[PDB]
Curated annotation (Swiss-Prot):
Native source species: Streptococcus pyogenes serotype M1
Family: Belongs to the CRISPR-associated protein Cas9 family. Subtype II-A subfamily.
Name used for this protein in its record: CRISPR-associated endonuclease Cas9/Csn1
Keywords: Antiviral defense, DNA-binding, Endonuclease, Exonuclease, Hydrolase, Magnesium, Manganese, Metal-binding, Nuclease, RNA-binding
Reported uses of this protein in biotechnology and industry: Coexpression of Cas9 with an artificial single guide RNA (sgRNA) which fuses the crRNA with the tracrRNA in human cells has shown it is possible to target and modify DNA sequences of interest. Cas9 plus the 2 sgRNAs have also been expressed individually in human and mouse cells to achieve DNA targeting; cleavage efficiencies of the artificial sgRNA were lower that those for systems with the 2 sgRNAs expressed separately. Microinjection of Cas9-encoding mRNA and a synthetic sgRNA into zebrafish embryos induces targeted mutations.
Complexes and interactors: Monomer. Binds crRNA and tracrRNA.
Cofactor remark from the record: Endonuclease activity on target dsDNA requires Mg(2+). The RuvC-like nuclease domain should have 2 divalent cations, while the HNH domain should have 1. Crystals are often soaked in MgCl(2) or MnCl(2+).
Keyword match Glycosyltransferase: no
Annotated gene: cas9
Length: 1126
DNA sequence: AGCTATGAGTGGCCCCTGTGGAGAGAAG
DNA sequence: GGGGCCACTCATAGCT
RNA sequence: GGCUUCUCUCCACAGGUUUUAGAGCUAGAAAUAGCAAGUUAAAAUAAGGCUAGUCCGUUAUCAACUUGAAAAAGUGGCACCGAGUCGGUGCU
């Protein structure tokens, strides 16, 4: 008798519930066979559980790390390129300089040259640090010096710039000279009054420098500056000029009465040619106005960055840092003098004690600038003559470091100007600098375009670059070796979605002329007209459709019903009155691309030729693909014989956006076998049928449906793994779905492989995507008519229904007590699913037998924590390299153990070197997983183990479960620590009262229900003691933490006077002590309770090891006590 | 008987961070 | 959030 | 309509840490006290891998046993009864 059942699921991001229910809704339990060498042969477990696992990580952290690694590699490579450039001349002056630079990190013992990395003699180091206190002094010296400079210093400056070349958010040359806001603003006002003497404006008394450089948003600054300008509006010509000076994107259409939009932005890569467009429309007289606007914008943005405008130099960043250092020196001297004279007691704390947030901690220690200002402010308040120091502290300019987080805003054009100045002033005395100047400027400025990507020879799963030749790519031949046009096309296309109806085909651009014709004809297909003398509405003929398109759609950008009635039905067909159905007011489709090309090419015969359709489609694709206009220009040059120079320049500056939904093959690529017409052909003319796109693809009399079905991949089960990961959503939900499918498969196996009658599923707040993956596998049988025989029904539900069903019949839930809530949610989901198609539910809730399974995952990821700890005399520090002994060089710490292996061998113990039989868990860190799996015996012997019994080696990943006396379980967190493995269970009687009491004021309900809650909570003061009694008993039984439990009991007795609700929130805080997983610190009322930690793994070395399947229904108990016996 | 080495428990502290530009998608 | 590490004390095995 | 959620991929940037370099002085045998100084740089930023790429290394996948290089396939009885992390009656 094959028993009927169904499968319910509770899918989350951290957990995947599961359940099996029958006709009477009871969850059965089956006697599962227990494999292994223990005395236990079978365990009867309930068909319910809750898989738990670490939350799936989005690749965001991994992607950031990968992009960082590529930046590091390419920056090291820039260093290598500069060292190759310097290499030949370096050997003539100092051959080992580059070697010393690499050996700087090592101690004096490991260095192969003299310990001074720059000069190798201490006299020259003294001279260097006396002459150049920092690097910015050296940069200024090199930028200003005319004398022959030392090559090592030049390399240091150039490498400092190349390694820290600043941001690329501004393209086009930027003048560092213009940095004064107010003077240039008045200059712009004077220029505007010169070009417009008839209507000049006055800006006297307006503090433009303060307002425009204020720390406010661009719109606020624009409003504030205009508010000081009489007669001016923020939307006016001058207001738009100011907005342009602020880096916004003003629209000049209304300012010059232009027909088309005129939007300009200096920060865009295309300001110059768009400005030329505007000048060609309004005249060349306005060129100086926009030039002054650009200069003022440069001045404003620079003043937002640097502060030294008084000093005259062409290195506007070295001077700023030197000035900061001088201010720091002078202010420190003054502060030390004042503290010496007035408050001698705290001199030591401020200037010596590296453990405080004083100047010692700020400079010689680890304290940041904010904390240093916090600590130094009250001391300044308590002393006289500190007005200047208080002012500088208000400006965040007191005692400020050169290398702070404010250097980010520096444009890379400043660094490029400094680089050019250096390479110009040093080229005379060093020929190779002059010869390779362009190469170095390239290396600083060369940036692998965001559309090219990783430069891989196919060996990468992230690479899409297409190559012309096989030369090694260097910045100087990046253009020559790689076709940037093809690279950009691949970059765009690989991301663009493939057609749904045609999976192998590509989607068309939105502004495709063929797509526009398709849409126009498809919309015109269902248009019906009613004229006098006609009994029924009739579809428009193909001739009528073509005439309408030619008369209106090619002549008007937007066509309305009234315009159609007036222009075609009355003028052409001589129908005075016509009724149109299917279109309400106007036609949605528009030949905007066709009208634009009519404006540009101005040859309507060329556009109307179907022979030119391929050329026009290629033009649309070229305009849609490429943002950099050079790519479009080079591609469209294949058509330079078809258009004049002006038309070609017009095509260059036009751009299109968006990608459509359908492919060219689907519309005008495939043809009917019987007729030879495409879908576009049928839409243009279909006779009486007048079938639209949907009708054409769903007509069985046409071969189009057959072509689509054949094109549809009728593939076998192709990579069930990586199939689910193809969905749209976070990787967390993807992992949830995959684990859900695996759990469903294992449940199918457990239930005798008889497929379920129904499947009830919910999803964490996408459900359809989950349902398809399951109903594809569940239903695979076809009847005599090729129809699917649905032996499995897939129903998906909503959390509101389940929550209401729970609260109506009091199947309440608490999310803080224990982890049985996932399984309970799964069971209630199954019950509600059958409801769409009472004691049992309470029994299922009250079962402690639940199979909570922590997914034993071999941890991957960071080998150890990223914070490098100081050098110490300890053995637990991890080397960061092969030659970096952790004692001598510090290094990483806190390894993440991949898994641990039970090693039974003999180890020499004591100074006597006597071999002693041992049995202990050795944790294999992730850094050594490959070495261990390569040859376990050599790895184990390397750690001091001898006569290793390879037969007894067991692989124990993180969260491997052990069973001890009284059923005490400890999950293997790592080699030297455990976790609580037992799931504390409270009966429902405590479960209801806890959430009723803690969420007391927060709940809102009817007055009688609130009174019932009052009575229910007030009576259970006796439960408030039973809860801590159960906690204490479970603690003694498994937690075994008497000190923390005693502190809890004392605190609970101490705070018993406070009201029941206030007690309740703290009582639920207790369960952080008992809940499965790692212990976490919790506080009871005012009292803070330390966390109990299990740093002892000895007790499990004699325990019954348990392996559990993904559901845990199949297990293999191993008794380790029988292993290792002598 | 006394000195040193060494394993278990407990209390405390630590852990990389911030930003910009471009493209393409699901769903609201 | 949680595993790792250290400073500290105490019981116990070992040793003579 | 836009700009939102959320994901991927790419391009860059400013820091942070470690270790070393930036000669600490005086009195005192030393412990130690007084004084002076604190702003920068190099290297590394997951060990490393072979396909030697200006590529790849934290995403995702992974109970145990048998076969298989691997993908992959197979491996374990059910019912009644009562059912705290489980046991009995028939029966396989």
């Amino acid at each position: 008798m094959d028993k009927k059942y169904s499968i319910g699921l509770d899918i989350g991001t951290n957990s995947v519930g599961w359940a099996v229910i029958t006709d009477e809704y009871k969850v059965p339990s089956k006697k599962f066979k227990v494999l292994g060498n223990t005395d236990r042969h079978s365990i009867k477990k309930n068909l319910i559980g809750a898989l738990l696992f670490d939350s799936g990580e989005t690749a965001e952290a991994t992607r950031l790390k990968r992009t960082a690694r590529r930046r590091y590699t390419r920056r090291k490579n820039r260093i290598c390129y500069l060292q190759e450039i310097f290499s030949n001349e370096m050997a003539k002056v100092d051959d080992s300089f580059f070697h010393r630079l690499e050996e700087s990190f090592l101690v004096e013992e490991d260095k192969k040259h003299e310990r001074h990395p720059i000069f190798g003699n201490i006299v020259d180091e003294v001279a260097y640090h006396e002459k150049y206190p920092t690097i910015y002094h050296l940069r200024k010296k090199l930028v200003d010096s005319t004398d022959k400079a030392d090559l090592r210093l030049i390399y240091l400056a150039l490498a400092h710039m190349i390694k820290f070349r600043g941001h690329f958010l501004i393209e086009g040359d930027l003048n560092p000279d213009n940095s004064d806001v107010d003077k240039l603003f008045i200059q712009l006002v004077q220029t505007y009054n010169q070009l417009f003497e008839e209507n000049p404006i006055n800006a006297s008394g307006v503090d433009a420098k303060a307002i425009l450089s204020a720390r406010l948003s661009k719109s606020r600054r624009l409003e504030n500056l205009i508010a000081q300008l009489p007669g001016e509006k923020k939307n006016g010509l001058f207001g738009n000029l100011i907005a342009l000076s602020l880096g916004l994107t003003p629209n000049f259409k209304s300012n010059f009465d232009l027909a088309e939009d005129a939007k300009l932005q200096l920060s865009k890569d295309t300001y110059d040619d768009d400005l030329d467009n505007l000048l060609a429309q309004i005249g060349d007289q306005y060129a100086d106005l926009f030039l002054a606007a650009k200069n003022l914008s440069d001045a404003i943005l620079l003043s937002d960055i640097l502060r030294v405008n008084t000093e005259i130099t062409k290195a506007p960043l070295s001077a700023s840092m030197i000035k900061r250092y001088d201010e720091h020196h002078q202010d420190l001297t003054l502060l030390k003098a004042l503290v010496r004279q007035q408050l001698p007691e705290k001199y030591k704390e401020i200037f010596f004690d590296q453990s405080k947030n004083g100047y010692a901690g700020y400079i010689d220690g680890g304290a940041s600038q904010e904390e240093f200002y916090k600590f130094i402010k009250p001391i300044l308040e308590k002393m006289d003559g500190t007005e200047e120091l208080l002012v500088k502290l208000n400006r965040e300019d007191l005692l400020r470091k050169q290398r702070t987080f404010d250097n980010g805003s520096i444009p890379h054009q400043i660094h490029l100007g400094e680089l050019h100045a250096i390479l110009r002033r040093q080229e005379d005395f060093y020929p190779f600098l002059k010869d390779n100047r362009e190469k170095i400027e390239k290396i600083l400025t060369f940036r692998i375009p965001y559309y090219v990507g990783p430069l891989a020879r196919g060996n990468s799963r992230f690479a899409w670059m297409t190559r012309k030749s096989e030369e090694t790519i260097t910045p100087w031949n990046f253009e020559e070796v790689v076709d940037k046009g093809a690279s950009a096309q691949s970059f765009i296309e690989r991301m663009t979605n493939f057609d749904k109806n045609l999976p192998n085909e590509k989607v068309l651009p939105k502004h495709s002329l063929l797509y526009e014709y398709f849409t126009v004809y498809n919309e015109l297909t269902k248009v019906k007209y009613v004229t006098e003398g006609m009994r029924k509405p009739a579809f428009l003929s193909g001739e009528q459709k073509k005439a309408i398109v030619d008369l209106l759609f090619k002549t008007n950008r937007k066509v309305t019903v009234k315009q159609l009635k007036e222009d075609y039905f009355k003028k052409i067909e001589c129908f005075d009155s016509v009724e149109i159905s299917g279109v309400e007011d106007r036609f949605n489709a528009s030949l905007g691309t066709y009208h634009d090309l009519l404006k540009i090419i101005k040859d309507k015969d060329f556009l109307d030729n179907e022979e030119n359709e391929d050329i026009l489609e290629d033009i649309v694709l070229t305009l849609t693909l490429f943002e950099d206009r050079e790519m479009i220009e080079e591609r469209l040059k294949t058509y330079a014989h078809l258009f004049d120079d002006k038309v070609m320049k017009q095509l260059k500056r036009r751009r299109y956006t968006g990608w459509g939904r359908l492919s060219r093959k689907l519309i005008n690529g495939i043809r009917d076998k019987q007729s030879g017409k495409t879908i576009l052909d049928f839409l243009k003319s279909d006779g009486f049928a007048n079938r639209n796109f949907m009708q054409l693809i769903h007509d069985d009399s046409l071969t189009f449906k057959e072509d689509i079905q054949k094109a549809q991949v009728s593939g076998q089960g192709d990579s069930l793994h990586e199939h689910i990961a193809n969905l749209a959503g976070s990787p967390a939900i993807k992992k949830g779905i995959l684990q859900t499918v695996k759990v469903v498969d294992e449940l199918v196996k457990v239930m005798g492989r008889h497929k379920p009658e129904n499947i009830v599923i919910e999803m964490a707040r996408i459900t359809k995507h989950v349902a398809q993956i399951l109903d594809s596998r569940m239903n695979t049988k076809y009847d005599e008519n090729d129809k699917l025989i649905r032996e499995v029904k897939v129903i998906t539900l909503k959390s509101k229904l389940v929550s209401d069903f729970r609260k109506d019949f009091q199947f309440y839930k608490v999310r803080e007590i224990n982890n049985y809530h996932h399984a309970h949610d799964a069971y209630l989901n199954a019950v509600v699913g059958t409801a769409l198609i009472f004691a049992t539910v309470r029994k299922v809730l009250s079962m402690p037998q639940v199979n909570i399974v922590k997914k034993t995952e071999v941890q991957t990821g960071g080998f150890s924590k990223e914070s490098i700890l100081p050098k110490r005399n300890s053995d637990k520090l991890i080397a960061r390299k092969k030659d970096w002994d952790p004692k001598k060089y510090g290094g990483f710490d806190s390894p993440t153990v991949a898994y641990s292996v039970l090693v039974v061998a003999k180890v020499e113990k004591g100074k006597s070197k006597k071999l002693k039989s041992v049995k202990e868990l050795l944790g294999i860190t992730i850094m050594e997983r490959s070495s261990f799996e390569k040859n376990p015996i050599d790895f184990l012997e390397a750690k001091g183990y001898k006569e290793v019994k390879k037969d007894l080696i067991i692989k124990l990943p993180k969260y491997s479960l052990f069973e001890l006396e009284n059923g005490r379980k400890r999950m293997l967190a790592s080699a030297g620590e455990l976790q609580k493995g037992n799931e504390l269970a409270l009966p429902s009687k405590y479960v209801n009262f806890l959430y009723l009491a803690s969420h007391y004021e927060k709940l809102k309900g009817s007055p009688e229900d609130n009174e019932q809650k009052q009575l229910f909570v007030e009576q259970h003061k006796h439960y408030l003691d039973e809860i801590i009694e159960q906690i204490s008993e479970f603690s003694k039984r498994v937690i075994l933490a008497d000190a923390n439990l005693d502190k809890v009991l004392s605190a609970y007795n101490k705070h018993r006077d406070k009201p029941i609700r206030e007690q309740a929130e703290n009582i639920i805080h207790l369960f952080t002590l008992t809940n499965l997983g790692a212990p976490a610190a919790f506080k009871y009322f005012d009292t803070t309770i330390d966390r109990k930690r299990y740093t002892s793994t000895k007790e499990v070395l004699d325990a019954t090891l348990i392996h559990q399947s993904i559901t845990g229904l199949y297990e293999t108990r191993i008794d380790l006590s029988q292993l290792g016996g002598d």
